[PDB]
Write a protein that binds this ligand. Structure first.
Ligand code: NA
Lengths: 132, 135
């Protein structure tokens, strides 16, 4: 159910509406802090517009999921938006189902916990604490 | 473009017609010899209907992308067909562009070499030989 929220967000980042999705867009800031220029990362490093762009993107994020799903969710939604804006919506659909399905349960719970805290106004940002 | 012909075949195996494509369908027999019942490979071993089916399929064939495009092309086309028939056409399109572009130029030329021979009636089946310069 939270999986499905994540999938929906990644799949439809470009047009989607609702508070929970606006919340998730605040994760962009983490990706920007981490990589600096996202366009450069997408266009020059990963070549996301190439014929292998979907697979090269997933290969880039595959190990960092268990490090920080916040980053992977942010990057996946941004590349999905990029692909939708270049008529590769099919890649958005393929990415969303696989990223959402591949976040391990520990990391999924962690993301849900920190998002919940943000959504109730307990925290300024979506943090990375574990609910022990 | 030969590459684009392969992409078209994989993308649209379920509905595509034409001499080049019916020829590529003869490669199924290679896949069936290699792996046996394709349905079992797809449904039980690879679980291609799962949310990660696309990526699990690509991972399964990735070792052959470089060295045996006959089998990779056949299996990709067959799983594409399966996904079109189970309402996941978006997977057909993601698969076709990636597989077609990930086959090395030398293996491309090889497939083209053997396919042309088949289509010209010089061989009974689509072989796996190299021309003088790649052998
Ligand atoms: Na020939």
């Amino acid at each position: 159910s939270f999986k499905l929220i994540l999938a929906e967000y990644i799949r439809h980042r470009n047009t989607i509406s609702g508070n929970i999705y606006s919340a998730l867009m605040t994760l962009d800031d983490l990706a920007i802090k981490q990589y600096g220029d996202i366009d450069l990362l997408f266009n020059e490093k990963l070549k996301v517009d190439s014929d292998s762009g979907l697979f090269d993107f997933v290969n880039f994020v595959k190990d960092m999921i268990c490090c920080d799903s916040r980053i992977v969710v942010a990057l996946s939604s941004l590349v999905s938006k990029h692909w939708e804006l270049t008529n590769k919506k099919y890649r958005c659909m393929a990415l969303a189902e696989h990223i959402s399905d591949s976040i391990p349960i520990s990391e999924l719970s962690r993301l849900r916990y920190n998002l919940s805290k943000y959504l109730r106004g307990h925290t300024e940002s979506i943090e990375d604490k574990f609910d022990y």
